[PDB]
Amino acid sequence: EECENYFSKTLLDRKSEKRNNSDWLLAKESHPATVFILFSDLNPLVTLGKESFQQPEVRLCQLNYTDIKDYLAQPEKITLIFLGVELEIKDEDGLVAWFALGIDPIAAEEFKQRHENCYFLHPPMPALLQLKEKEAGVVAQARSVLAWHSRYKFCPTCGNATKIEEGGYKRLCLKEDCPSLNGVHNTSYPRVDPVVIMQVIHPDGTKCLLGRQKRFPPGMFTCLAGFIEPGETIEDAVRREVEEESGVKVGHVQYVACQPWPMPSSLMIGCLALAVSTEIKVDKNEIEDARWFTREQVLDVLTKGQAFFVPPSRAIAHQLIKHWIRIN
Amino acid sequence: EECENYFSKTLLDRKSEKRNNSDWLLAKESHPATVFILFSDLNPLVTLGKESFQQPEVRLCQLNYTDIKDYLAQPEKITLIFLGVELEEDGLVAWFALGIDPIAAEEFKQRHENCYFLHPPMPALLQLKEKEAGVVAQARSVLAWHSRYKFCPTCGNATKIEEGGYKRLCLKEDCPSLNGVHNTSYPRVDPVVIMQVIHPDGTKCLLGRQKRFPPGMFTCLAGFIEPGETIEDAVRREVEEESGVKVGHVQYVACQPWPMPSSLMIGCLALAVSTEIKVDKNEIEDARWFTREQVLDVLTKGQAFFVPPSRAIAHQLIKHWIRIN
Numbered sequence: 001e002e003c004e005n006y007f008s009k010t011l012l013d014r015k016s017e018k019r020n021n022s023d024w025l026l027a028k029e030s031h032p033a034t035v036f037i038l039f040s041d042l043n044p045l046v047t048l049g050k051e052s053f054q055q056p057e058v059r060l061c062q063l064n065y066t067d068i069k070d071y072l073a074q075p076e077k078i079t080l081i082f083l084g085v086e087l088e089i090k091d092e093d094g095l096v097a098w099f100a101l102g103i104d105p106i107a108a109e110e111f112k113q114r115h116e117n118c119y120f121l122h123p124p125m126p127a128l129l130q131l132k133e134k135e136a137g138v139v140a141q142a143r144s145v146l147a148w149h150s151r152y153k154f155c156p157t158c159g160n161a162t163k164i165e166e167g168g169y170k171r172l173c174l175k176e177d178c179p180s181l182n183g184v185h186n187t188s189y190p191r192v193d194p195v196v197i198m199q200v201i202h203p204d205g206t207k208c209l210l211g212r213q214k215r216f217p218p219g220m221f222t223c224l225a226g227f228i229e230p231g232e233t234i235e236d237a238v239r240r241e242v243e244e245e246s247g248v249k250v251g252h253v254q255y256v257a258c259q260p261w262p263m264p265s266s267l268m269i270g271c272l273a274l275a276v277s278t279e280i281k282v283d284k285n286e287i288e289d290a291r292w293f294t295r296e297q298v299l300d301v302l303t304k305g306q307a308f309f310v311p312p313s314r315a316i317a318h319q320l321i322k323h324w325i326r327i328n
Numbered sequence: 329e330e331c332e333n334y335f336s337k338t339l340l341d342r343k344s345e346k347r348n349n350s351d352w353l354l355a356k357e358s359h360p361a362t363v364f365i366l367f368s369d370l371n372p373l374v375t376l377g378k379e380s381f382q383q384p385e386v387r388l389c390q391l392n393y394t395d396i397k398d399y400l401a402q403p404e405k406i407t408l409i410f411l412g413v414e415l416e417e418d419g420l421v422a423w424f425a426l427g428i429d430p431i432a433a434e435e436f437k438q439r440h441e442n443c444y445f446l447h448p449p450m451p452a453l454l455q456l457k458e459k460e461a462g463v464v465a466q467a468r469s470v471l472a473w474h475s476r477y478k479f480c481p482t483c484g485n486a487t488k489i490e491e492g493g494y495k496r497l498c499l500k501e502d503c504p505s506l507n508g509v510h511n512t513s514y515p516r517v518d519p520v521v522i523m524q525v526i527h528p529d530g531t532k533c534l535l536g537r538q539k540r541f542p543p544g545m546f547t548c549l550a551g552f553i554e555p556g557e558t559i560e561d562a563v564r565r566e567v568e569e570e571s572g573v574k575v576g577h578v579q580y581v582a583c584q585p586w587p588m589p590s591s592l593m594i595g596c597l598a599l600a601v602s603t604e605i606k607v608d609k610n611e612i613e614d615a616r617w618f619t620r621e622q623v624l625d626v627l628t629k630g631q632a633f634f635v636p637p638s639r640a641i642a643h644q645l646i647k648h649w650i651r652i653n
């Protein structure tokens with residue numbers, strides 16, 4: 001399967017080989033064809049796009065060196081990440097390099113005044129679900145990496161400050177005697193948080209389990225999810241979280257889909273699970289309510305019902321719910 | 329599927345509900361039935377076990393409060409993690425992991441005499457029992473997080489251990505990590521994709537090796553999942569990046585935790601759409617197509633090459649392709 005769920009599609013080729021090519025990156029930074037994306041507090045600069053009278057779609061305000069040349073003069077006040085090179089199979093190494101630039105919110109509102117037509121897409125939820133399919137992944141990659149730099153400014157091993165390197169996909173500790181510099185450790189590389197999201201099916205196969213936290217919007221039920229524990233497997237993390245939150249024992253756990261979640265860095269691992277019990281014992285400390293919903297109740301929601309609703313189609317939870325109805 | 333690959337099996341129930349129950353943990357710390365595992369520089373204390381004339385099996389030297397009571401008096405010099413409760417007053421066999429100074433460890437090793445520390449992690453950790461493996465995988469992974477994430481990456485200040493050793497809080501009041509729920513506070517899990525690339529004709533498979541790899545050993549191609557990247561697309565990426573082979577369909581096959589220090593192997597069986605190999609040399613020293621006969625020879629008793637042990641996921645995906653043929 002070729003991952004399709006929102007954030008799975010990109011307009012770029014990561015080209016990680018060009019990351020340790022300082023001579024190349026430096027040349028592409030000043031190149032005119034090079035595309036730049038502006039970010040303020042992990043929020044991308046987007047304009048509104050060629051439409052005639054109809055509802056206009058949100059597109060990323062694609063900057064060039066001409067605009068961004070001024071901001072680059074303060075490398076201590078900015079964060080530049082090389083995203084990759086554009087895809088163009090149809091029709092100097094002619095590659096459209098793409099970069100991501102993080103700036104101060106003091107200098108950002110200054111830029112927003114000059115832009116006038118371009119604006120920052122905030123809050124990340126649900127605003128980030130508006131972008132184009134291929135633009136989504138580019139933002140998912142950008143936001144995730146920038147979020148790592150914004151919150152991992154220091155070395156967790158010794159506490160000393162860190163230097164950005166390898167085009168923004170590495171961080172080196174400046175304390176010479178630090179043990180992080182002796183070998184290869186995760187402290188230097190960017191974080192990816194694995195999350196399991198599961199569609200639990202009743203032992204009779206006619207119902208499915210859905211729940212909600214306190215923060216969740218009123219009357220909205222979704223698939224149960226949780227972070228994979230260290231030294232734990234994908235399948236056993238599914239069996240754990242369902243029993244922990246709802247008190248429902250799980251049997252077979254089948255992997256179904258992939259969905260990146262740039263909040264800030266997370267990877268949703270969608271699973272279709274078969275439950276072996278029927279009683280629900282809600283934790284209240286992890287989930288406010290959990291219930292068994294019949295296939296008719298769900299079919300009503302996925303079409304146009306109802307006393308409850310599920311997440312949008314651009315959220316993996318919705319796709320696993322859709323999967324069970326088709327698989328029935 | 330119920331994950332079977334080495335490190336997938338545990339003797340415990342994690343019981344994360346009991347983590348924020350400080351009153352309960354304190355009572356179980358002094359309880360006699362409670363099991364303790366000693367660790368020195370992420371290496372567990374193991375004894376040897378019974379069998380006569382043949383290879384003796386490696387087992388964990390299961391300590392009790394009677395032994396460990398002295399070490400607990402210095403909480404600044406130790407790291408205690410609540411693992412979980414054994415699967416079989418709330419009659420539950422609590423299990424803990426204790427990290428100690430190598431100065432105080434060699435002092436204990438002298439008293440133990442029969443128990444010894446299982447070092448180096450590779451390949452020594454592959455010797456343990458199936459169910460003991462996962463317990464070590466869980467323990468080593470968490471202890472390794474505490475040993476290298478002693479400070480807050482957001483502001484640089486020191487951090488406090490909490491929630492039975494599954495959380496770390498920054499002590500700087502104005503720190504933004506204390507403002508909301510962030511990954512800086514929780515333990516790390518590094519996702520890795522390991523893929524079995526099948527030749528477009530299905531009779532061959534792609535295997536490669538780095539410079540560090542033991543001489544003449546070829547394995548499945550693997551790599552870390554990039555931020556904002558999917559499991560399937562990370563497979564299609566790494567294969568083309570290392571070997572220059574274009575990948576088609578990517579099918580998930582198996583789960584395998586890798587406590588080196590924290591990693592989760594996501595085994596996939598992928599179909600190649602190209603045949604030419606263009607080795608990177610900066611990531612892989614050599615890559616080749618191996619026929620099913622060449623592979624069958626290795627998995628039995630050949631050969632000019634060999635694959636990883638059966639307790640490594642790479643070996644299981646290789647076995648999977650032979651069965652699936």
Ligand SMILES: C[n+]1cn([C@@H]2O[C@H](COP(=O)(O)OP(=O)(O)OP(=O)(O)O)[C@@H](O)[C@H]2O)c2nc(N)[nH]c(=O)c21
Binds near residue numbers: 227265
């Ligand atoms: C990076 N990060 C962010 N959070 C936030 O803290 C909240 C606590 O709630 P939660 O951790 O139970 O969320 P869940 O595990 O279902 O994952 P998600 O729905 O895919 O996000 C989460 O819902 C996130 O908004 C996180 N929460 C936890 N527990 N662990 C993390 O690593 C983490």
Ligand SMILES: C[n+]1cn([C@@H]2O[C@H](COP(=O)(O)OP(=O)(O)OP(=O)(O)O)[C@@H](O)[C@H]2O)c2nc(N)[nH]c(=O)c21
Binds near residue numbers: 518549
């Ligand atoms: C936690 N960590 C440890 N390493 C070590 O650095 C080496 C660099 O080599 P590698 O990163 O290419 O290993 P691979 O991606 O094939 O993953 P593995 O075979 O499952 O480990 C790895 O082989 C590890 O020994 C790591 N290497 C990288 N790149 N990133 C990490 O997060 C990381």
